[PDB]
Amino acid sequence: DEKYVNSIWDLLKNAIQEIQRKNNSGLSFEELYRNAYTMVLHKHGEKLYTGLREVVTEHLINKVREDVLNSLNNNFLQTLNQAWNDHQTAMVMIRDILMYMDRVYVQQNNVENVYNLGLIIFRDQVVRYGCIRDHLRQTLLDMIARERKGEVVDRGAIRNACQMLMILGLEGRSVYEEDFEAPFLEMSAEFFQMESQKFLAENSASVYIKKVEARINEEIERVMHCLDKSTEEPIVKVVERELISKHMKTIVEMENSGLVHMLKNGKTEDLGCMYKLFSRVPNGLKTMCECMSSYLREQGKALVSVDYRQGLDDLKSRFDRFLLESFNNDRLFKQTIAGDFEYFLNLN
């Protein structure tokens, strides 16, 4: 009879609210599970499911949303993370009580299970409400920007917040990508851009390359301790794009510091560090080769125009040394050096 079904629901609604109140200690698991079992058994899973969504939504909007909104300007991440752990804790016990519905009904009606429904209501009503959405985005981005400038920030609050955005993606990163990754990569591209303008403006090519490796490493260690492992590749590409790709021809041709200069003074290591950095990006090694072809050809025509042969053997040996010790015997570099030698040795 339907009126006792209402009594079952009253027992479950009261119980759920006591769990949301963290007063699960003193609730008989068996009676709540058995009653929920009986409701679903008589095909009232639809009534039970609607009730669950209502009570959970009611709880997260009237209490949790307000608590989070009140901490916006005073320890925001601690309270939001606190609300997330309290939500997960309550939902586990709640998912246990409705286990029978979770195995028969949600399977039949292509609907999200109790735990995922709890994540969706939390994601949509809390994490992505709006004022909260914007404040969490500003905070996390503000922290990464302070740390990059030399400040010390709470990496754990970021790890807990990013992990939350990942889970709310429902075995996906949609929430994390839209809310965090996209703006993070945007503001990072701009930070690395102004950083490159300054570094290009003062430092030598060698120092610029060392600072690019240092920035790459700094962002990877940041991903390992704060962000999601899946963000490692996108951030490095942005670092690679803004500091290298967009200044490729500028770096190799840097006046009194570039590639040709390193070639002139036999700075073997500096050329190797340049190779290591430019091999990361497309057309990086192509630029290095075009620069090298111009220098090697210019050197060769001036050399061909006992001392002459030792000069040519030292130039060949010098560039073979450069190829093995610095260019990792690169297929592209071996073909270029050979092709250049085949041009000036054939000219006269």
Binding site: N24, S25, G26, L27, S28, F29, E30, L32, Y33, R34, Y37, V40, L41, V92, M93, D96, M99, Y100, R103, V104, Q108
Partner: protein
């Protein structure tokens, strides 16, 4: 650099544990199965093996509710006949069922969720089919919860 396995061991260990139960020794739980007609029963058993067997038990004693450390708590599902046959499975991987009670046994597996011992009834019943008794059979399959024979219902 090595790494070994002993397939005979989960079985053997499981025997030793049954024997530990049947001596009504080392148990951490006691169940007062109580249902309308039948008189209340007390079953001494190990919490940890019950959880191994059923998820409804894993969660019962779990981080969940007031069954956190009870030592003694009721169950009001079916006749303790089936909770016995069931525990027999939970400690031996085997269950002796009857041409009659298999309804109550299966509904048992269903309620505390033992999908192994439920699918073994799923295939138990296919054997002695009756076009006479087929009616009530399909009634079970739709009532039961899992429309798993309701389709296979010819």
């Amino acid at each position: 650099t090595f790494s070994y396995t002993l397939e005979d061991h989960t079985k053997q260990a499981f025997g030793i544990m049954n024997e530990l139960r049947l001596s009504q020794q080392l148990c951490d739980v006691t169940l007062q199965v109580k249902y309308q007609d039948a008189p209340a029963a007390q079953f001494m058993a190990h919490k940890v093996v019950l959880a191994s067997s059923s998820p409804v038990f894993k969660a019962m004693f779990t981080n969940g509710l007031r069954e956190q450390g009870m030592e003694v708590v009721s169950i009001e599902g079916i006749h303790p006949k089936v909770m016995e046959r069931l525990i027999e499975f939970a400690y031996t991987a085997s269950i002796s069922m009857g041409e009659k009670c298999v309804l109550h046994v299966m509904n048992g597996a269903v309620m505390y969720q033992i999908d192994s011992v439920v699918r073994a009834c799923s295939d138990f019943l296919v054997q002695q089919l009756d076009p006479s008794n087929a009616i009530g059979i399909a009634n079970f399959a739709e009532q039961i919860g899992c429309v798993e024979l309701h389709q296979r219902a010819r």
